[PDB]
Enzyme design. Structure first.
Site, PDB file in Angstrom:
ATOM      1  N   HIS A   1       0.850  -1.211   0.055  1.00 32.09           N
ATOM      2  CA  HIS A   1       0.161  -0.098  -0.066  1.00 32.09           C
ATOM      3  C   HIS A   1       0.854   1.335  -0.097  1.00 32.09           C
ATOM      4  O   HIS A   1       1.738   1.276   0.671  1.00 32.09           O
ATOM      5  CB  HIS A   1      -0.768   0.173   1.217  1.00 32.09           C
ATOM      6  CG  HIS A   1      -1.635   1.336   1.578  1.00 32.09           C
ATOM      7  ND1 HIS A   1      -1.240   2.210   2.411  1.00 32.09           N
ATOM      8  CD2 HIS A   1      -2.508   1.834   0.784  1.00 32.09           C
ATOM      9  CE1 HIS A   1      -2.254   3.135   2.501  1.00 32.09           C
ATOM     10  NE2 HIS A   1      -2.771   3.101   1.414  1.00 32.09           N
ATOM     11  N   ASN A   2       0.520   2.339  -0.722  1.00 32.04           N
ATOM     12  CA  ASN A   2       1.051   3.815  -0.841  1.00 32.04           C
ATOM     13  C   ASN A   2       2.422   3.626  -1.078  1.00 32.04           C
ATOM     14  O   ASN A   2       3.381   4.045   0.005  1.00 32.04           O
ATOM     15  CB  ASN A   2       0.664   4.773  -0.003  1.00 32.04           C
ATOM     16  CG  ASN A   2      -0.801   5.245  -0.241  1.00 32.04           C
ATOM     17  OD1 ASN A   2      -1.242   4.913  -1.584  1.00 32.04           O
ATOM     18  ND2 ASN A   2      -1.323   5.900   0.716  1.00 32.04           N
TER      19      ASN A   2
ATOM     20  N   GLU B   1       1.725   0.296  -5.339  1.00 31.10           N
ATOM     21  CA  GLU B   1       0.674   1.315  -5.687  1.00 31.10           C
ATOM     22  C   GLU B   1       1.358   2.631  -6.162  1.00 31.10           C
ATOM     23  O   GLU B   1       2.571   2.953  -5.487  1.00 31.10           O
ATOM     24  CB  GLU B   1      -0.060   1.481  -4.126  1.00 31.10           C
ATOM     25  CG  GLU B   1      -1.060   2.381  -4.471  1.00 31.10           C
ATOM     26  CD  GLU B   1      -2.157   2.586  -3.138  1.00 31.10           C
ATOM     27  OE1 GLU B   1      -3.325   3.192  -3.186  1.00 31.10           O
ATOM     28  OE2 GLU B   1      -1.916   1.583  -2.234  1.00 31.10           O
TER      29      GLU B   1
ATOM     30  N   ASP C   1       0.105   6.663  -6.776  1.00 27.67           N
ATOM     31  CA  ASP C   1      -0.950   7.739  -6.451  1.00 27.67           C
ATOM     32  C   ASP C   1      -0.684   8.883  -7.353  1.00 27.67           C
ATOM     33  O   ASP C   1       0.757   9.185  -7.146  1.00 27.67           O
ATOM     34  CB  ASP C   1      -1.347   8.153  -5.253  1.00 27.67           C
ATOM     35  CG  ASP C   1      -1.823   7.084  -4.206  1.00 27.67           C
ATOM     36  OD1 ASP C   1      -1.891   6.093  -4.649  1.00 27.67           O
ATOM     37  OD2 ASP C   1      -2.056   7.525  -3.042  1.00 27.67           O
TER      38      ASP C   1
ATOM     39  N   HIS D   1       0.944  11.648  -1.550  1.00 29.48           N
ATOM     40  CA  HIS D   1      -0.357  11.487  -1.169  1.00 29.48           C
ATOM     41  C   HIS D   1      -1.207  12.842  -1.148  1.00 29.48           C
ATOM     42  O   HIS D   1      -0.836  13.675  -0.558  1.00 29.48           O
ATOM     43  CB  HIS D   1       0.013  10.984   0.194  1.00 29.48           C
ATOM     44  CG  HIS D   1      -1.294  10.172   1.065  1.00 29.48           C
ATOM     45  ND1 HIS D   1      -1.520  10.031   2.153  1.00 29.48           N
ATOM     46  CD2 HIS D   1      -2.506   9.773   0.374  1.00 29.48           C
ATOM     47  CE1 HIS D   1      -2.572   9.588   2.432  1.00 29.48           C
ATOM     48  NE2 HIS D   1      -3.288   9.363   1.144  1.00 29.48           N
TER      49      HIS D   1
ATOM     50  N   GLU E   1      -3.620   4.684  -8.820  1.00 29.04           N
ATOM     51  CA  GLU E   1      -4.964   5.512  -8.126  1.00 29.04           C
ATOM     52  C   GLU E   1      -4.671   6.769  -8.782  1.00 29.04           C
ATOM     53  O   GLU E   1      -3.999   7.558  -8.549  1.00 29.04           O
ATOM     54  CB  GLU E   1      -4.692   5.509  -6.616  1.00 29.04           C
ATOM     55  CG  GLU E   1      -5.898   6.107  -5.848  1.00 29.04           C
ATOM     56  CD  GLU E   1      -5.498   6.833  -4.589  1.00 29.04           C
ATOM     57  OE1 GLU E   1      -5.434   7.719  -4.382  1.00 29.04           O
ATOM     58  OE2 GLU E   1      -5.429   5.713  -3.802  1.00 29.04           O
TER      59      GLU E   1
END
Ligand SMILES: [Ca+2]
Ligand SMILES: [Cl-]
Ligand SMILES: [Cl-]
Ligand code: NA
Length: 606
Positions: free
Chosen positions: A172-173, A202, A204, A217, A251
């Site tokens: 995650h992230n 991931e 973003d 983020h 994302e």
């Protein structure tokens, strides 16, 4: 006499200026290539020179120090049992030990020779095809005798099933290396994850200045990196640790113009690595296998339209074409550039509505992403429907949005119902990442593990809350014999701890278990328990076993000294060592436990 000549031969160089201090003792011990803990060596050195004017040691001192740190009584007992108290093991005596005590059968006469050639340091002894005690300690301390089965250190599982049939190592992230709100984004997030064999990363994506997409983020103070640089890193490291396919979980929060830049960078930097068309027919009815997709990178993102439209749009330039998709993806309608939409083939991110809706309408190339809190509700109240879902569709779980310090949930909850992509904050120390790292040791560290049969059958009635007829009971007995050079307590002024060992089973709820050894007072160097632990596990294919070594600080507090976790069915048998890891995930070598392991499955027997 032989041993002593060997020993003097190695070290005497060191004493050319007479007796040596502590820094020189340390440099000299390294010439013997056995790992040691400085605090332990410092202690035995201080006890050697305590009542003396000069704090230097002579050759006899140094031998006693070496013996105290390196020699182990528990290994001496075993060695003298097979040697009959002779000085050396005959090759037939070593063969006996390997077969009977480590169950290294089939090629034991063979493996004996190999152990001597590989580990015996005394040239004399090695030529007689024998093993000294020096050679035995080296063998027993090696990677050949650790608790993780040697056969599981390569890719041994069947890699030819559809992608949905595997647990997939998932971050995650990934761009974050610390917290979620004020710390840095960094390419090191991607490098570190990939080197551990992580397969699902991931990214973003946000609009940058200069019309160039950036990664951070959203709506926080985290620093930025360029999208371009992330893709260059993926190009270099995707297949560093594993041959098996990488999924980029995008994302997307970019405007359509910057989404086109995303597509261009992916295409131009990754080249032939990027999967940009179906492998077979254009009407996809099951996913390809990991084996079929070796050395490929797949894009997971929202998609507008069919794969059929994608194949038609390849005859032309699609710059300026945009679709609409059903949401903007955020941690719990939007425009998409069709140039980016068109990179999605087997990994379309699809909004989750309900298990019934997915059964009725979702395709095999559609995956769902479900937040921790919602997924926990489904595990508690709908576990068999969850199994039905994950047997058909790739499902990704991610940490709830309030974990702004990057803490992790317990991943075993979701593996219990067949969730393939249980995404964790890889950067964060704690038991969740210990379970993750232990689990994905299996199958050669390649980051894909074949799920049990009862999670792959699309009509399974498996429920982790009530295993019933899916049970395959395994009986396990572990003798905890000793520990060796455990890290001293942070409070000890010398080299002491009050160690205890906790053995834990993680798995389906009815299998979870905790056992503790007694506490040994004031001995980190060579604690000896000789205590036996027994378990029954109904669902061994989902179980992880963790050894947690603690220091009893006070009536109300224990401190962590080190740990090791692995799959229950990856346990070696007979005598073996448990290597230990710090909270940071660093090797604590030489800290180890020495155990004897035995287990059997009820399913072998009529
Ligand atoms: Ca994200
Ligand atoms: Cl947190
Ligand atoms: Cl955590
Ligand atoms: Na960076």
């Amino acid at each position: 006499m032989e041993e002593n000549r060997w020993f003097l031969n190695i070290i005497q160089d060191g004493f050319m200026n007479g007796k040596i201090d502590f820094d020189s003792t340390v440099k000299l011990l390294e010439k013997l290539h056995m790992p040691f803990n400085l605090a332990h060596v410092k202690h035995v050195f201080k006890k050697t020179v305590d009542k003396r004017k000069i704090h230097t040691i002579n050759i006899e001192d140094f031998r006693a120090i070496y013996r105290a740190i390196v020699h182990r009584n528990e290994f001496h007992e075993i060695f003298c049992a097979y040697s009959e108290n002779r000085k050396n093991l005959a090759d037939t005596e070593l063969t006996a030990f390997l077969k009977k005590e480590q169950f290294k059968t089939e090629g034991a006469e063979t493996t004996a020779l190999e152990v001597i050639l590989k580990y015996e340091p005394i040239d004399e002894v090695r030529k007689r095809r024998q093993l000294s005690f020096e050679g035995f300690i080296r063998y027993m301390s090696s990677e050949d005798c650790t608790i993780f089965k040697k056969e599981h250190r390569t890719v041994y599982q069947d890699m030819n099933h559809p992608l949905c049939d595997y647990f997939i190592s998932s971050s995650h992230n990934t761009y974050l290396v610390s917290d979620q709100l004020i710390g840095p984004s960094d390419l090191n997030g991607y490098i570190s994850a990939l080197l551990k064999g992580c397969r699902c990363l991931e990214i973003d994506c946000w609009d940058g200045s200069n019309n160039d997409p950036v990664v951070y983020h959203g709506h926080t103070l985290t620093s930025k990196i360029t999208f371009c640089s992330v893709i260059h890193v993926v190009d270099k490291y995707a297949f560093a640790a594993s041959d098996y396919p990488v999924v980029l979980s995008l994302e997307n929060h970019c405007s359509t113009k910057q989404q086109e830049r995303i597509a261009q960078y992916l295409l131009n930097i990754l080249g032939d690595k990027l999967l940009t068309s179906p492998i077979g027919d254009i009407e996809v009815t099951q996913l390809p296998s990991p084996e079929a997709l070796k050395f490929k990178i797949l894009v997971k993102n929202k998609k507008c339209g069919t794969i059929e439209e994608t194949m038609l749009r390849k005859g032309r330039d699609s710059h300026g074409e945009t679709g609409e998709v059903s949401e903007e993806e955020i941690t719990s309608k939007m425009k998409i550039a069709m140039g980016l939409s068109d990179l999605v083939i087997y990994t379309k991110s699809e909004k989750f509505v309900s298990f019934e809706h997915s059964l009725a309408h979702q395709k095999c190339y559609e995956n769902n992403s479900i937040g921790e809190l919602k997924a926990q509700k489904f595990v508690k109240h709908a576990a068999n429907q969850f199994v039905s879902h994950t047997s058909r569709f790739i499902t990704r779980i991610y940490p709830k949005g309030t974990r702004a310090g990057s803490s992790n949930y317990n991943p075993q909850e979701f593996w219990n119902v067949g969730c393939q992509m249980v995404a964790l904050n890889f950067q964060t120390s704690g038991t969740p990442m210990e379970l993750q790292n232990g689990k994905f040791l299996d199958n050669g560290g390649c980051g894909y593990i074949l799920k049990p049969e009862f999670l792959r059958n699309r009509n399974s009635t498996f429920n982790p809350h009530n295993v019933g007829r899916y049970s395959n009971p395994l009986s396990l007995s572990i003798r905890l014999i000793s520990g060796h050079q455990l890290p001293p307590s942070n409070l000890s002024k010398s080299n002491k701890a009050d160690p205890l060992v906790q053995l834990e089973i993680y798995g389906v709820p009815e299998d979870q278990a905790k056992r503790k050894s007694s506490v040994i007072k004031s001995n980190a160097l060579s604690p000896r328990w000789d205590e036996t632990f027994s378990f029954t596990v109904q669902v061994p294919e989902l179980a992880l076993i963790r050894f947690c070594v603690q220091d009893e600080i006070s009536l109300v507090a224990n401190d962590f000294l080190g740990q090791y976790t692995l799959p229950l069915l990856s346990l070696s048998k007979g005598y073996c060592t448990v290597p230990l890891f710090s909270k940071s995930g660093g090797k604590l070598e030489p800290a180890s436990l020495f155990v004897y392991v035995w287990y059997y499955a009820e399913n072998l027997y009529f």
